[PDB]
């Protein structure tokens, strides 16, 4: 769903590549009413339409607006920031250095300095947690007229304040519309509408002063009205209008016996709504609740349609591979020789994978030698990668990311950065190579400065992104055309022109037919070495047991039975070599013996008990 | 172009309990776009001593001034009025526009009968051509939540708005009037203000006033030190 878009999790440090930043801003907010992470708005120019922002109305974590040299940010219909996530961890906004001095960097007349001038917040009347921290903007105004304690709710704990003041310019009074002087900004507009301080007794929120303008204890942002219903923000969840305090449970008590979900209205959580599904890329667990990681004592199991959900360990807990970011490797941040060998035949990681200078380049101090390009084939297995996958280094060595030939998908649950599920830099490999994957689960896709890099508008991105706000951004890779120019194009048999690297081993879809893992014209059909059918556009071995048919069809199944015509001697199951003497049919059943006939049947052979008849044979 | 306050009555001489106006017109309404607020204040100059600020906003009354001080006038008129004079109101009356940089001052008006502390550095006699750098000392108040202008006064007794400097950043608006002549300077650990006289000539001879100012309600330039005269050979 578009009006859901993720977090973002980088903070101050800054854009990986910058030539693309506002890029991935844009993608991920675009359409977005509610981040279900951080709003982090950092680093971005004077002359920056950021127009995207302007449907912005919850925010799950905190909002971070930092290094930015443009004069304004139009979040007006923000209005609640929850807290569930702080910006050092005690901040719910934190306001950062965002007018330079500038050093007469423009003309000595600039036409006007840098900075962010008024936080233009019309809408703001929710902080559940985190406190404000605002510091060393010098063209800012306002800030300090708030009054910040209607904001905070009743319950926030980490309600601190610190708001530097100091200013270059002169702020104009506040609208003469703004009775109590509070504002945002100078415009009439901008006057900051309170919601809590202003109440009747025993209250929470409230719409003015008197006790019918007091809003439901489940509103939390403001109210039109007194209902759940007429909330602006709910405290917790909204049940498809009415603000509730918890989902519907799913295991109903039906007045005779524990029964089964109400769920025609039994529903999931799912950030500050309730869902009938858990949407893509979330697991369901049997608590009603969408996550991310499963419960303690759980496993991720599937379904055939695509679900994915928790349930109990019945067994002990089957054990798994960690990725980075998990449990042992929680804080470990690179694969390295340490801790290679733990990746040894694994199908699925649990985490993440980054690959940086440290693994391939000794750190001699941990005495941790450098990654042997040997040792990567390690991954030769995995299919599945639940969190994001990094790669800052790779040996010059290899051409590709042909040691990861078997990964599917990248689920991006963790996101490198808080927005990147795959992220390639500076490693001239010459083309991916990455001829199974077929999903990126959730995030961006970032692959910038790999001066060798071709094949990277043969790749169907469009085809592995799920959500919206997913996007390929990429610079700096070699010139598309210095690539064709080179001999380097997708196979001839590449279906639609999308491959992941040269050769018939990369096609997405042959446009004819595949054996094995590559594209080939005709299957043996008819004129074959081995015969062999085709079952959706594959070629798939015939049994050894069918007989060549030379000039017409040979079989019609993988099976004996399927088989055409049979080479020796047939058993009504199947085409077989050798009719059965006696084998054990069962664990406590009578033995077989039969015998060919001239027409190749094998019939059964009259006996007794002890001696039988085995072609003439006891 | 720059705006020009004018006002009525050049001097007024007048009977102990008489009630007289105060008249000022602007160039241009002395108003901004966003706000219905006017940007004019009146400020009290009684010989001897700094001017002192009556009413800011046209409309709205410094805290401390009597009741008999009015403020009157919006858009391009506006006009001061003492219900009864009093012998504590004989001063000169400066009309004083904050609306558009350069700040302005009208003419003045002298009627006639029948905590803050911003401490300015000693005079000065200053031979023409050289220059001089004197300073001000501001105590109680937070000094960086606050601006540091810089008015001359001249002779003949009109003022002159020199410039503004952030007393954070040292950020500085100057006026045109005295781009090559003045140069405000800041030692903000210290809560003084600077300013430089440069190639001093004849019509430098004046007194330099240092003149606070802040934010919002406050924006109107308040609290005046006692000035220092430089006068040159």
């Known amino acids: 769903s578009t009006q859901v878009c993720t977090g973002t999790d980088m903070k101050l440090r800054l854009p990986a590549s910058p030539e693309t930043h506002l890029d991935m801003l844009r993608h991920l907010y675009q359409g977005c009413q509610v981040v279900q992470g951080n709003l982090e708005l950092t680093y971005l120019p004077t002359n920056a339409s950021l127009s995207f922002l302007q449907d912005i109305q919850e925010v799950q974590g905190y909002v971070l607006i930092a290094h930015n040299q443009v004069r304004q940010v139009p979040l007006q219909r923000l209005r609640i920031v929850r807290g569930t996530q702080l910006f050092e961890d005690n901040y719910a906004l934190a306001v950062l250095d965002n007018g330079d001095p500038l050093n007469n960097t423009t003309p000595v007349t600039g036409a006007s300095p840098g900075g962010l001038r008024e936080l233009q917040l019309r809408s703001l009347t929710e902080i559940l947690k985190g406190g404000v921290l605002i510091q060393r903007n010098p063209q800012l105004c306002y800030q300090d007229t708030i009054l910040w304690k209607d904001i905070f709710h009743k319950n926030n704990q980490l309600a601190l304040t610190l708001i530097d003041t100091n200013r270059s310019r002169a702020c104009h009074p506040c609208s003469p519309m703004c009775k109590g002087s509070r504002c945002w900004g100078e415009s009439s507009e901008d006057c900051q509408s309170l919601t809590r301080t202003v109440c009747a007794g025993g209250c929470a929120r409230c719409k003015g002063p008197l006790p019918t303008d007091c809003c439901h204890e489940q509103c939390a942002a403001g109210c039109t009205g007194p209902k759940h219903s007429d909330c602006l923000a709910c405290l917790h969840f909204n049940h498809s209008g009415i603000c509730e305090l918890h989902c519907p449970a799913l295991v109903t008590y039906n007045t005779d016996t524990f029964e089964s979900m109400p769920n025609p209205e039994g529903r999931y959580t799912f950030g500050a709504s309730c869902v009938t599904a858990c949407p893509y890329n979330y697991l369901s667990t049997d608590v009603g609740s969408c996550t991310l990681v499963c419960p303690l004592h759980n496993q991720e199991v599937t379904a055939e349609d695509g679900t994915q959900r928790c349930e109990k360990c019945s067994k002990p807990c089957a054990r798994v591979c960690y990725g980075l970011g998990m449990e042992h490797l929680r804080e470990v941040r690179a694969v390295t020789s340490a801790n290679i060998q733990e990746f040894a035949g694994c199908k699925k990681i649990f985490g993440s994978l980054a690959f940086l200078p440290e693994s391939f380049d000794g750190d001699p101090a941990s005495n941790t030698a450098p990654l042997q390009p040997e040792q990567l084939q390690v991954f030769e297995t995995l299919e599945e990668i639940t969190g994001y996958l990094y790669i800052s280094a790779w040996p010059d060595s290899l051409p590709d990311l042909s040691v990861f030939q078997n990964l599917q998908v990248i689920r991006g649950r963790i996101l490198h950065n808080g927005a990147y599920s795959l992220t390639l830099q500076g490693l001239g490999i010459s083309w991916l190579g990455l001829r199974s994957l077929r999903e990126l689960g959730s995030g961006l896709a970032l692959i910038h400065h790999n001066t060798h890099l071709c094949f990277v508008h043969t790749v169907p991105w469009d085809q592995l992104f799920r959500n919206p706000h997913q996007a390929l951004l990429h610079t700096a890779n070699r010139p598309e055309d210095e690539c064709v120019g080179e001999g380097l194009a997708c196979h001839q048999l590449c279906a639609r022109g999308h491959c992941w690297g040269p050769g018939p081993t990369q096609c997405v879809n042959c446009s004819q037919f595949l054996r094995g893992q590559e594209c080939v014209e005709e299957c043996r059909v008819l004129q074959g070495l081995p015969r062999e059918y085709v079952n959706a556009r594959h070629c798939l071995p015939c049994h050894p047991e069918c007989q060549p048919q030379n000039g017409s069809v040979t079989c019609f199944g993988p099976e004996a039975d399927q088989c055409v015509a049979c080479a020796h001697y047939k058993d009504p199951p199947f085409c077989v070599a050798r009719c059965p003497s006696g084998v054990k049919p069962d664990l406590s059943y009578m033995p077989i013996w039969k015998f060919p006939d001239e027409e190749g049947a094998c019939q059964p052979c009259p006996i007794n008990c002890t001696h039988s008849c085995v072609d003439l044979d006891d | 172009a720059d705006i020009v306050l004018t006002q009525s009555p050049d001097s007024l001489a007048v009977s102990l309990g008489e009630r007289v106006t105060i008249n000022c017109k602007s160039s241009?309404?002395?108003?901004?776009?966003?706000?219905?607020?006017?940007?004019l204040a009146w400020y009290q100059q009684k010989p001897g001593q700094s001017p002192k600020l009556l009413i800011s906003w046209a409309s709205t009354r410094k805290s401390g001034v009597p009741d008999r001080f009015s403020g009157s006038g919006s858009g391009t008129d506006f006009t001061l009025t003492i219900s009864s004079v009093q012998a504590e109101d004989v001063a000169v009356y400066y009309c004083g526009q904050y609306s558009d940089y350069p700040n302005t001052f009208g003419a003045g008006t002298k009627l006639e009968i029948k905590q803050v502390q911003l401490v300015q550095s000693g005079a000065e006699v200053v031979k023409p051509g050289a220059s001089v750098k004197i300073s001000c000392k501001a105590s109680?108040?937070?000094?960086?939540?606050?601006?540091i202008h810089w008015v001359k006064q001249n002779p003949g007794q009109r003022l002159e708005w020199i410039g503004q400097?952030?007393?954070?950043?040292?950020?500085?608006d100057y006026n045109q009037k005295f781009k090559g002549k003045a140069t405000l300077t800041v030692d903000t650990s210290a809560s003084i203000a600077y300013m430089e006289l440069s190639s001093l000539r004849s019509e430098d001879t004046a007194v330099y006033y240092c003149?606070?100012?802040?934010?919002?309600?406050?924006?109107?330039?308040?609290?005046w030190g006692q000035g220092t005269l430089v006068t040159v050979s």
């Open positions: 400097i952030s007393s954070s950043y040292a950020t500085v």
């Open positions: 003149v606070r100012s802040g934010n919002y309600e406050e924006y109107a330039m308040d609290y």
């Open positions: 241009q309404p002395l108003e901004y776009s966003n706000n219905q607020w006017n940007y």
């Open positions: 109680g108040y937070p000094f960086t939540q606050y601006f």
